[PDB]
Amino acid sequence: PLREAKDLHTALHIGPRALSKASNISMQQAREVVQTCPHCNSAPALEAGVNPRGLGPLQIWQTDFTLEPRMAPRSWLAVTVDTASSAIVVTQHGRVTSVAVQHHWATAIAVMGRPKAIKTDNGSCFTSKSTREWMARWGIAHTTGIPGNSQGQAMVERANRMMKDKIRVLAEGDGFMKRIPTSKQGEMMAKAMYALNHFERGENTKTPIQKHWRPTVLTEGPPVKIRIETGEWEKGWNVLVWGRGYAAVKNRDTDKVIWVPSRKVKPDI
Amino acid sequence: PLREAKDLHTALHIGPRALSKASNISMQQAREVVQTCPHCNSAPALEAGVNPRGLGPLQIWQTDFTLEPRMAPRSWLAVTVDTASSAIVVTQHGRVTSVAVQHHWATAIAVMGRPKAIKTDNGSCFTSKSTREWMARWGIAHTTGIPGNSQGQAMVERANRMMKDKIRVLAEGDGFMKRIPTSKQGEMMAKAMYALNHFERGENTKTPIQKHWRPTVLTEGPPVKIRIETGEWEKGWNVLVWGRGYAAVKNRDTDKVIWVPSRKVKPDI
Amino acid sequence: PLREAKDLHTALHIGPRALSKASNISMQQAREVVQTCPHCGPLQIWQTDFTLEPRMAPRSWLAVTVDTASSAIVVTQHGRVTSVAVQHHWATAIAVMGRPKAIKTDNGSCFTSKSTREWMARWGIAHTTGIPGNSQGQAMVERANRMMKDKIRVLAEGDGFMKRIPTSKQGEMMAKAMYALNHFERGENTKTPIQKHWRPTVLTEGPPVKIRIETGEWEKGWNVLVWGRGYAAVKNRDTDKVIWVPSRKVKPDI
Amino acid sequence: PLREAKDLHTALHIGPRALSKASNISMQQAREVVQTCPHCGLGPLQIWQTDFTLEPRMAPRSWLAVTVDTASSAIVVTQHGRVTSVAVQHHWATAIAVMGRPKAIKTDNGSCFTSKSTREWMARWGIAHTTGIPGNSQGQAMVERANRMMKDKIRVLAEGDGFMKRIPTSKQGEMMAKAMYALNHFERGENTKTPIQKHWRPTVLTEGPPVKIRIETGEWEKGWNVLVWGRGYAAVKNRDTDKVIWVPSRKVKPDI
Amino acid sequence: PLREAKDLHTALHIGPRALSKASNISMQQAREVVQTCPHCPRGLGPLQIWQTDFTLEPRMAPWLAVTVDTASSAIVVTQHGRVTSVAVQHHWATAIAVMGRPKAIKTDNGSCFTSKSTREWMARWGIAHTTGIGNSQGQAMVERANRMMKDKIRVLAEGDGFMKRIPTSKQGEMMAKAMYALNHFERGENTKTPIQKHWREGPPVKIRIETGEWEKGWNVLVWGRGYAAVKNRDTDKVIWVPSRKVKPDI
DNA sequence: AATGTTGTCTTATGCAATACTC
DNA sequence: CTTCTTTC
DNA sequence: ATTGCATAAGACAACAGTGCACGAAAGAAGAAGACACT
DNA sequence: AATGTTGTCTTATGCAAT
DNA sequence: CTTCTTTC
DNA sequence: AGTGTCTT
Ligand SMILES: [W+6]
Numbered sequence A, B: 001p002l003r004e005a006k007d008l009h010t011a012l013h014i015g016p017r018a019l020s021k022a023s024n025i026s027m028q029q030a031r032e033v034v035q036t037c038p039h040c041n042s043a044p045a046l047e048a049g050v051n052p053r054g055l056g057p058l059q060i061w062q063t064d065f066t067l068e069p070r071m072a073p074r075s076w077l078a079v080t081v082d083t084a085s086s087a088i089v090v091t092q093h094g095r096v097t098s099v100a101v102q103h104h105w106a107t108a109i110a111v112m113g114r115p116k117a118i119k120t121d122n123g124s125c126f127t128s129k130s131t132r133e134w135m136a137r138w139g140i141a142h143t144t145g146i147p148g149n150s151q152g153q154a155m156v157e158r159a160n161r162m163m164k165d166k167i168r169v170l171a172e173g174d175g176f177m178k179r180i181p182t183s184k185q186g187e188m189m190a191k192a193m194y195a196l197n198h199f200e201r202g203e204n205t206k207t208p209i210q211k212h213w214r215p216t217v218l219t220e221g222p223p224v225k226i227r228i229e230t231g232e233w234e235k236g237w238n239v240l241v242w243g244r245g246y247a248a249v250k251n252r253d254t255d256k257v258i259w260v261p262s263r264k265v266k267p268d269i
Numbered sequence C: 001p002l003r004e005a006k007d008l009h010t011a012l013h014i015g016p017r018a019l020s021k022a023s024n025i026s027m028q029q030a031r032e033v034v035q036t037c038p039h040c041g042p043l044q045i046w047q048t049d050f051t052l053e054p055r056m057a058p059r060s061w062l063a064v065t066v067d068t069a070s071s072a073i074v075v076t077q078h079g080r081v082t083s084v085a086v087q088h089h090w091a092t093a094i095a096v097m098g099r100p101k102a103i104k105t106d107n108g109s110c111f112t113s114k115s116t117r118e119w120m121a122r123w124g125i126a127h128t129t130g131i132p133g134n135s136q137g138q139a140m141v142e143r144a145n146r147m148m149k150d151k152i153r154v155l156a157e158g159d160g161f162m163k164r165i166p167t168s169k170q171g172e173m174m175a176k177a178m179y180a181l182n183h184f185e186r187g188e189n190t191k192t193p194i195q196k197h198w199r200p201t202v203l204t205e206g207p208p209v210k211i212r213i214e215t216g217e218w219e220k221g222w223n224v225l226v227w228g229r230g231y232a233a234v235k236n237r238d239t240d241k242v243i244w245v246p247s248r249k250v251k252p253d254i
Numbered sequence D: 001p002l003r004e005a006k007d008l009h010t011a012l013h014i015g016p017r018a019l020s021k022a023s024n025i026s027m028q029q030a031r032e033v034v035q036t037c038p039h040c041g042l043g044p045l046q047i048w049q050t051d052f053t054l055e056p057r058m059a060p061r062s063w064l065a066v067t068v069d070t071a072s073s074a075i076v077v078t079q080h081g082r083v084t085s086v087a088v089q090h091h092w093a094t095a096i097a098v099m100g101r102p103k104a105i106k107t108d109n110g111s112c113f114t115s116k117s118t119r120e121w122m123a124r125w126g127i128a129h130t131t132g133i134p135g136n137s138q139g140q141a142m143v144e145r146a147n148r149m150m151k152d153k154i155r156v157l158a159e160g161d162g163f164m165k166r167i168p169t170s171k172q173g174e175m176m177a178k179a180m181y182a183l184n185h186f187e188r189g190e191n192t193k194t195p196i197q198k199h200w201r202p203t204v205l206t207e208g209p210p211v212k213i214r215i216e217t218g219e220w221e222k223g224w225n226v227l228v229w230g231r232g233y234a235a236v237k238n239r240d241t242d243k244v245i246w247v248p249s250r251k252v253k254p255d256i
Numbered sequence E: 001p002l003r004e005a006k007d008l009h010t011a012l013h014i015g016p017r018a019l020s021k022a023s024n025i026s027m028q029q030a031r032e033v034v035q036t037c038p039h040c041p042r043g044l045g046p047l048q049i050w051q052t053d054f055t056l057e058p059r060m061a062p063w064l065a066v067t068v069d070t071a072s073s074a075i076v077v078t079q080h081g082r083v084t085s086v087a088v089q090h091h092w093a094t095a096i097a098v099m100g101r102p103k104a105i106k107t108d109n110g111s112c113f114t115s116k117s118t119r120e121w122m123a124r125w126g127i128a129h130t131t132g133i134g135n136s137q138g139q140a141m142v143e144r145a146n147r148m149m150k151d152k153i154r155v156l157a158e159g160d161g162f163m164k165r166i167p168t169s170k171q172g173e174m175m176a177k178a179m180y181a182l183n184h185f186e187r188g189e190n191t192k193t194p195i196q197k198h199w200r201e202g203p204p205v206k207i208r209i210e211t212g213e214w215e216k217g218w219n220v221l222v223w224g225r226g227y228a229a230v231k232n233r234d235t236d237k238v239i240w241v242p243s244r245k246v247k248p249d250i
Numbered sequence F: 001a002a003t004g005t006t007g008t009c010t011t012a013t014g015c016a017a018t019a020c021t022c
Numbered sequence G, J: 001c002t003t004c005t006t007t008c
Numbered sequence H: 001a002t003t004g005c006a007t008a009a010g011a012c013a014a015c016a017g018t019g020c021a022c023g024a025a026a027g028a029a030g031a032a033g034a035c036a037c038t
Numbered sequence I: 001a002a003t004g005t006t007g008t009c010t011t012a013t014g015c016a017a018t
Numbered sequence K: 001a002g003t004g005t006c007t008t
């Protein structure tokens, strides 16, 4: 049956259940036949990726431009968020230039303070010599991303949800439909980012401004296990941050801290 | 604090968790406040009951065109599947014409038999008076689809993902990567259709041939309950088909048969 | 330390106390650096005032707001003095700091108008007026006016702008000034205006909880440090021993 | 560990990270050791900085030709008696023999760099050359620090072996060599990798295992091999061109 | 590719594997290029055993001293003028700066390496020394370095137009082309460059092959969700196999 | 060089407190 | 006899 | 008595005729001529 | 007039031999 | 001193 | 005045 099944899959590439039933082969073997085939293994998962987040506020920032035509003429919205505090700062601009990046960054620093590093995309206004000189002056490390995959920029584009879903609702509330009047744009914006920092975020236990100015940093965390490349669970780690998607775990022997998917962490003892 | 919370949401449109905590209101009330707001319409009521299925073999067919450049210059693949037996029939054509549709349906009839009804999407070939007058002589019911949002012919469009992949796997297996030579295209077709229809489809207990020529039609099914618009569970129904996604259920008092989502059916007693 | 402080003052013109503390410089030296330059409870009561600024044209009028205890400062540029401008500046102020209790203004028309009046009722803020420019209500707001009217001028001259700041860089001047004032120390106190406002600290541990122990009882004396999927890690306050328990077995203590 | 670290610093005056790693000593101790002693950017092999310095302690061969890799911090120095068009080409030749053939080299406008002979030497090797004043910050500023590094290591080494103001000739070429081994093979500073490991890729992986990558249209394309596979990203090389690109983990799956 | 390969061999006389990889040419052509030119127990560890001997080439008139690593295949030559026991200390001094500190250096017992100055010099570096008891396995290694340096300098100098001798101003300069040709670019039919074996995995593992047998000789490089990438130690071919088909080797 | 995000949306259980049906 | 339009 | 097994979970995935069309912003690449070197 | 669908895909659970 | 390649 | 890197 094993050779007959191999020949059958060679010619027809029959799935494993059919070969297992037809030739009376156990499922592990039939699956082994599909696995050993080069063309039929065209769907392995091989998925991973952590945003990542910072262990404390004013450490990791993310910034990107988004287009909200309601703010016309200055329809470009530069959005920035701290990964630890989840607090949002936004300004309006008419053109996406490095001047707008250093201006917006100047405002966000004027509100929340100076961050350790800002994580942007591969845009031309962020990769300009002038921007590198600006962050060279303010001492902020620069981290770009994949060319076209904003998944790593997730928790800033996630902000672009609120900033665009809150501006819609608040603008419709004051009776503005096609374009927000220029006299009330500042009020709209101020109330907008006012509602998203001093007040909780749905099921969030604290407010983003409280998580900003009064963050929770564990000195030494509780012990956890992590699932390592071979699929095994390894003791000897402690967790410092455990969020919804991902957790930050620290190795006990070195104090190195890494971010891993939640599914790959379980309590140690 | 019902009015205080309402005012807070009026101005800032604060979520229910925040208003419930801030104004000490129970959950149901705060949620009612968010619900009662028009510009915060959640909504999210989109009726999920959606069922494109038929009862018996040769009763309801699905037919659509798709592009696979491996068969060029005749790369146009016409696909027709029987919704009850899941038996696929595909024919290659250089250009999508009503004559090509009548040729395809002529072959699928020459293999499976004359169907009672065929459901397609409203294209140029199907909505022509010529194809209409062709189904006229053969007595086959014609059912078009929504202009653009083709999610109902899915069990044929999904068939393309079942089809074209089995093409590639058979093409790469024979050393043909870019375009399959004209001499072996038809053999590729026959080998694909024989691999799909004459063997189990993954977890399928019967083969499409065993499901077509030896189908299983229940004289009368076991009793079930269905969840009705008000959310209640109503007795007095019997289930005739219970698949992975959807179920066909029959009303005991009238013998009227309707299709409903699996999640909306449970055993009666 | 002397060069770092000099560079810092060149760009932001930070006062001597802040540079002395930040760069570990003795008082006399840091002060000498500031000298060599030629152009050199919280959230209870606020103070608002308008001031002229022809260099910030077209939006020349600047609205300034300051807190009494935290010494914070928020500014907004406007093209003319209107009620919507006052409400905009106040919405930005409460956006950066939060909704206060009382705000002290003057007897001006923009602050005594109707559109400004009814805006106080919805947001719930108290107002106080009196003599047109008295010494107890209009004192510190003028100090802030000196703060901003000096900072914008000196920084704008420091980046190469002399007569009129271009329309693009104006907001950047705003942000740089507010950064030089909020986050930096203009007084002998080691606490910045930002520090004196939010009282920034770090949660060394979690809030107190009770945990259900093997016998089913609920025991006080624990704080929770981690709440993961399914289980929670809780720490005993008297010993710092940490154990993992099911989420269902934890509830807030008091 | 305390004696091993003391001997290592005595001879080479190795920085604290290297001594901490070599003898398994914590950071506070290594830093105390450095204290107790009195005398104490994308891809590599792309841009070099070359300049001359005059160490009077290396006389009569006082002129030192220094070339440091910008993306590796690894340096190559050779002694010369006079700065001419031949000494520069010999130094560049030795450096190329040590750390591989680069593509660009940044120097100043000296006569030894603008001569026709050296120009032809640049042309025959297919290497780029640019001028300068010098005195910039982004470029032309790394070699300046490298010169102080080299003169400092030579000074601390020769003065460590009993030579004060002039190094004996019969030992000159040695007191230079012992410097480079301390500035290339061992880690100098506070980083993790060694300046030699901070050089070339390292050991540019001729072949990786086969992968597919998801291309703009959503398709999965064969013909790539992965050279680096990190948590977020993988480095994959096209087999037909040797072009290497970085892509998200979710867009890669095993081939075959 | 034809011009790139021809130019590369003209200047450096690079072997066929290196030219094939560098210019993406199939092996038959590169071998034809090598043809067209007229003058044209080894797995312990790198940086452990060195062979050093003196062999004279008259083209560098008025000596040469070689030092080769027995694993990385790299070579270092200093071209001394007078053969003394000091030239050995300076030669090894220049070698341990490029190839690093070796764990041992073995030389055939001569009147030059057995001196007390050389022995104290060995002890000063913590490097063990053993006079060669020069072996038959090294007969094809250190002499290989000798004649490979001689022939490489001969072909480079002849290609430059210098028949008998080389100008002393160009002598120290052409030393680099030889080491660069014999160290960076690959030589012979080998796969790894002499550099790629000095600065460079599995547990190892065994893999279950199509016939069901378990084969030793593989190391695993990637273990993802479901599948593993394993590398054959001999050919360096890498294949992906199911997790169930891999187990630790020893 | 540099990784997917949470803010909500409905319905499904487990336990106090009216309002009923004997 | 062109365009013009609705679908795939 | 533990471990080989054919079943769960519990998702990923892509079918929809084809995808590349354009703009902005900042930098890189190619090209015609002026002052210095040859 | 005319309803998002399944075949794989990985890693966790119940019946019988060394 | 214009016209391409990159990315958002 | 070749021609050549440097200017724009
Ligand atoms: W034809």
Ligand SMILES: [W+6]
Binding pocket: none
């Ligand atoms: W033909």
Ligand SMILES: [W+6]
Binding pocket: none
């Ligand atoms: W034909």
Ligand SMILES: [W+6]
Binding pocket: C054
């Ligand atoms: W004026």
Ligand SMILES: [W+6]
Binding pocket: C054
């Ligand atoms: W004036």
Ligand SMILES: [W+6]
Binding pocket: none
């Ligand atoms: W004035």
Ligand SMILES: [W+6]
Binding pocket: none
């Ligand atoms: W004036």
Ligand SMILES: [W+6]
Binding pocket: C054, C055, C163
């Ligand atoms: W003025």
Ligand SMILES: [W+6]
Binding pocket: C163
């Ligand atoms: W003026």
Ligand SMILES: [W+6]
Binding pocket: none
């Ligand atoms: W004036």
Ligand SMILES: [W+6]
Binding pocket: none
């Ligand atoms: W003036």
Ligand SMILES: [Zn+2]
Binding pocket: A009, A010, A013, A014, A034, A037, A038, A039, A040, B169
């Ligand atoms: Zn197959």
Ligand SMILES: [Zn+2]
Binding pocket: A169, B009, B010, B013, B014, B034, B037, B038, B039, B040
């Ligand atoms: Zn609302």
Ligand SMILES: [Zn+2]
Binding pocket: C009, C010, C013, C034, C037, C038, C039, C040, C154
């Ligand atoms: Zn100043």
Ligand SMILES: [Zn+2]
Binding pocket: D009, D012, D013, D014, D037, D038, D039, D040, D156
């Ligand atoms: Zn020292």
Ligand SMILES: [Zn+2]
Binding pocket: E009, E013, E014, E034, E037, E038, E039, E040, E155
């Ligand atoms: Zn040759």
